């Protein structure tokens, strides 16, 4: 569904999918080719 | 036709070797491919 963010202070709006890669366990959020957030960690459980 | 029966498929071995013969084609693509790369890397700038 598009839907408005707010992800730990971090806003924007989008559709919510599966991430199928490998990542970091630190990683807060991860940017694009143009700088911006399309892929972010959830905050209470481990997911991407 | 002994000349000119030859003188075609000299024309068919010279374009499935060199590529550069059609390079100038290549640089119709080359010119367009970095401009849409232009437009994607100005939102990373922070523009003051």
Known sequence: ?48 | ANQFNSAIGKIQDSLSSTASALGKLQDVVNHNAQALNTLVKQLSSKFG
Request: with cysteine; hydrophobic share 35%; proline share 4%.
């Open chain 1, 1 to 48: 569904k598009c839907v408005n963010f707010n992800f730990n202070g971090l806003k924007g709006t989008g559709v919510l999918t599966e991430s199928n890669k490998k990542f970091l366990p630190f990683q807060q959020f991860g940017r694009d080719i143009a700088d911006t957030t399309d892929a972010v960690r959830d905050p209470q459980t481990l997911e991407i």
